[PDB]
Ligand SMILES: *[C@@H]1O[C@H](CO)[C@@H](O[C@@H]2O[C@H](CO)[C@@H](O)[C@H](O)[C@H]2NC(C)=O)[C@H](O)[C@H]1NC(C)=O
Ligand SMILES: *[C@@H]1O[C@H](CO)[C@@H](O[C@@H]2O[C@H](CO)[C@@H](O)[C@H](O)[C@H]2NC(C)=O)[C@H](O)[C@H]1NC(C)=O
C-alpha cells in the first residue's frame with residue numbers, strides 16, 4: 499500500500515538480505531526501499547518522522563529530504579542537514595508539513611545526513627495529477643508500476659573512506675538482485691503485465707553513486723516525464739539514468755506472452771549479467787514461472803540522448819539566447835584533489851549552525867554566512883545561469899539543485915546550447931572532459947538551496963555549495979514552527995555542542 503499524504507514514518511534499524519547477504523540497515527517503514535509516499539498535486543503532506551534509530555555505526559540522528567519538491571515558503575522542511583535544519587535525534591519525532599502546489603510527477607525521499615541514505619533510507623514519492631495531460635497514453639499507473647534502481651553495499655557507509663572510489667556489491671531492482679561476487683541465486687524482482695495493456699512505468703534512480711543503462715528485452719519505452727516535468731513522447735530502447743533522476747515511460751505489453759529480462763547495468767561494479775546480476779524479470783500474465791531466455795542486442799539503436807527531450811508544455815528558456823545572457827551568469831570551478839572536492843576553491847564541510855538558522859538570526863550577506871566561501875547569494879526575481887564545466891575526477895557527476903527545476907541549456911557530450919526548447923529537470927549529468935553543461939532558472943523561491951553532486955560519496959567529500967536565494971526575504975517567506983526551532987537546541991544538547 500501507498501501511504502500519505504498525512505502519515506507517520508518510522509526510521510528503524512533492522513537486518514536485511516536483498517542480495518542474499520545479511521547486513522544491518524537504516525530503514526523507513528521497515529523495508530528497502532521504503533514505502534511509497536503519495537498524494538495528488540497541491541496536497542498538504544504531513545510526514546511525521548519518528549527517529550527510532552539506535553545503532554551508532556549508521557548514525558542515530560536523521561533528517562529526510564523530499565527530492566525535487568520545491569518547498570516554496572517551507573524551506574525549513576527541505577531536509578538537508580546543516581543547510582535547512584539540525585538532525586532529528588533518536589527517540590524524537592518531527593512533522594515535515596508542506597504543500598506541493600504546481601508539481602505532479604515522480605519524486606523520491608531519502609536521508610540527507612552524511613551518507614546515511616546509502617545504508618537504506620530511500621523510497622519513492624509520487625504526486626499524481628487527476629487531470630494529467632498524459633492520462634490517455636496508458637491504462638495502469640499505480641504502486642505496481644514504480645521501478646526503483648539501487649546500488650547496495652556490504653560494507654556500512656560510515657566505514658567507506660572519504661573521497662575514495664567506493665564500489666557497490668549488488669544492483670537492486672525493486673529491492674532485489676544478486677551480488678557481483680560470491681553470487682547466489684537469491685530471488686529476483688518480478689514486474690507483471692497483462693498482454694495488450696499499457697503501463698506508466700515510473701523509473702526512479704535511488705542510487706548513491708552509479709548510473710544505470712536500463713532496458714527491457716524485446717520492448718521499447720516511450721518517455722513522457724523527466725524529473726517531474728512532462729515531456730513530449732520520445733521512444734527509446736535504452737535509458738542511461740544518473741543518480742537521483744526519474745523518468746516515466748509507457749510500456750506497451752505488445753510482445754508475445756512470456757518472460758523478458760529487465761536490465762540495469764551500472765557504470766562501476768559488476769559488468770554483464772552472469773548468474774542473473776543486474777537483472778529483474780518482466781512476466782506476462784499466463785507465462786510460465788521461469789527465468790527469461792531473452793538476449794540484449796549488442797548495441798542499442800535508439801538510446802536516450804538528453805537533447806532529444808522536450809517539454810510537453812511551452813516552457814521556453816529564461817534570459818537571452820547566448821552564454822552569459824542572464825541577470826546573474828555564474829561559472830563554477832568544479833575540482834577534485836587529494837580525496838576532496840571543491841567548488842570555487844572551497845570544499846564543503848557542514849556548518850555547526852544550519853544556514854537557514856544563521857539567516858533567521860540576522861546574518862544577511864553571504865560573506866557573513868558559514869561555511870565561509872560555501873554560500874553564494876542570489877538576487878530575487880532574476881534569471882540565473884550556472885555553467886558546470888566537467889573534468890573533476892569521478893565523473894560523470896549528476897548535479898542537483900534543491901528548491902527548483904531548471905532548463906538544461908547545454909547537455910553532456912554536445913557543445914551546442916539550446917535556448918529554445920530544452921528539457922527542464924532537477925538532476926543533470928555534467929558530462930566529460932571539455933563539456934560545459936549549463937542550467938538556467940528564475941529566482942522566485944526565497945531560502946538557502948543546496949547545489950551538489952548527487953553521488954553521495956562526493957557530497958560527503960565536499961562537492962557542494964549553498965545558493966542563499968533572496969536572503970532579505972527568507973525570514974518573511976519561511977515562517978518556522980516551534981518544533982523546527984526546537985531541533986538545534988535538542989541536537990546540540992545531545993551531542994554536547996556549544997553554539
Ligand atoms: C562555459 O561557458 C561559460 C559561459 O557560460 C564560459 O565562461 C567564460 O569564461 C571565460 C574564461 O574562460 C571568461 O572570459 C568569460 O567571462 C566567461 N563568461 C562568458 C563568456 O559568458 C566558460 O569558459 C565555458 N567553459 C568551458 C570549459 O567551455
Ligand atoms: C546537439 O544539441 C543540439 C541543441 O540541443 C541539437 O540541435 C537541435 O537539433 C534539433 C533536432 O535536429 C533541431 O530541431 C534543432 O534546431 C537543433 N538546435 C540547435 C540550437 O542547433 C543536436 O541535435 C544535438 N546533437 C545530437 C547528435 O543529438
Ligand SMILES: [Cu+2]
Pocket residue numbers: 563565608742898952
Ligand atoms: Cu535527492
Ligand SMILES: [Cu+2]
Pocket residue numbers: 563564565566898899900901
Ligand atoms: Cu533535492
Ligand SMILES: [Cu+2]
Pocket residue numbers: 892893894895896951952953956957961
Ligand atoms: Cu560526483
Ligand SMILES: [Cu+2]
Pocket residue numbers: 563578610898900948950
Ligand atoms: Cu541535496
Ligand code: NA
Pocket residue numbers: 814815816817
Ligand atoms: Na525565452
